[PDB]
Amino acid sequence: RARLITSARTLMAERGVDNVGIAEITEGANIGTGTFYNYFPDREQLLQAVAEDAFESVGIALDQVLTKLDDPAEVFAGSLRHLVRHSLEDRIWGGFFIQMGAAHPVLMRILGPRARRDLLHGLETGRFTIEDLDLATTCTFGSLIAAIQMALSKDQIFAAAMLRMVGVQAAEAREIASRPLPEIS
Amino acid sequence: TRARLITSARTLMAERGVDNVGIAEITEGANIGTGTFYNYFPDREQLLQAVAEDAFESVGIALDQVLTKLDDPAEVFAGSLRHLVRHSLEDRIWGGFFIQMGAAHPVLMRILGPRARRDLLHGLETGRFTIEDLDLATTCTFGSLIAAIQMALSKDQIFAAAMLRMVGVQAAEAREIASRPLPEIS
């Protein structure tokens, strides 16, 4: 399971998140075809772990750079912008949305806590207006997907449209989502 | 014929489980076999969606005969949403399109989609809203309805407040306009 993730991850960077079969994976992991079924029941099961592991690397990366900005509205925008500006570059990431269906839950498990973290912080600050830190937190993810699938057929027009939903002044919104974006790595 | 079929399936699925409603048992309804239909319709998935779009065009056409007659646009919208939310938590057939369909969003876009563009665009001219990508606004709205109804299936005023606060309505004035008396429909 250790390598098994990072095996299929590697076989996507330049092979399509959909052209990976156990045969290659198990071999990269260094286990026999009939042993993979001892660490992952399905194949959507592995692909999902490949996803979590991916969001998590950014989930971590975000924390160590963005919540280091005093304004809540920016730490949210910033993280969001990164997530969109990410799905556009990473080949592997593109596949996680316009292809992976658990794309929503997968996000509620890796960023869900982080999302509520920031939506709550910017709330107790009076910066945001939230009447359900969960619905706000889920729509911030339903949106993130639909916004990306569309964009894969903006990393600002989007952020700007989320801060808005979190109550921010329509105008002041597009200004924050449009500020210089710190580096994620 | 592609009328009786979608009806046939609704009863079955609404009472067996969308997941176990073969192309067979469905046509037996509108009396046909299994190999007969695969021809009429391309795949079972289409028919399932034919039931989806069709199940939306119902409440849709219906929501147009009412809500649009309202004055404030942020209401017509919020109101039309609060109605879509209610309907989901109210039907074994609807709350079964979301938590089970991938088209969830895409079909919602084809049917109610435009209607949401129409009303948004308008409130956008009345000065009511502050949208920047009418597309991104109409898709995020539905991607949110699904994402929200799903949570609420494991609140309609609360979601609508958000949906307005997203299109630009005053963060505060948002909830008032949401909590107003929701008119009847179909």
Author numbering:
A (entry chain A): 32 to 184, 193 to 224
B (entry chain B): 31 to 184, 193 to 224
What did the study's authors say about this model?
The RolR protomer is folded as two domains, the DNA-binding domain at N-terminal and the signal-receiving domain at C-terminal. In addition, RolR is the sole TetR-type regulator that has been identified for regulation of aromatic catabolism. RolR is an all-helix protein and each subunit is composed of 9 α helices (h1, h2, h4–h10) and two 310 helices for h3 and g1, a stretch between h1 and h2.
The crystal structure of the apo-RolR is solved by the molecular replacement method using the N- and C-domains of res-RolR structure as initial models. The structure is refined to 3.6 Å resolution and the statistics are listed in Table 1. At this resolution, the electron density maps are qualified for fitting well to all mainchains and about 1/3 sidechains, which make the reliability to analysis the apo-RolR structure on the mainchain and secondary structure level with some sidechains for a part of residues. The apo-RolR structure shows the similar general fold to that of res-RolR, but the DNA binding domain shows some relative movement in comparison with that in complex res-RolR (2a, 2c). Besides, some subtle distinctions for h3 and g1, the stretch between h1 and h2, are observed, which take a short 310 helix and a loop, respectively. Structural comparison shows that the frameworks of the binding pockets in apo- and res-RolR structures are very similar without obvious conformational change at mainchains. The structural comparison between apo-RolR and res-RolR show that the orientations of DNA-binding motif h2–h3 and h2′–h3′in dimerization have been swung about 10 degree referring to the C-domain from the ligand-free form to the ligand-binding form, which further make the center-to-center separation of the DNA-binding domain (defined as the distance between residues Tyr68 in h3 and h3′) shortened from 34.9 Å to 30.1 Å upon the ligand-binding.
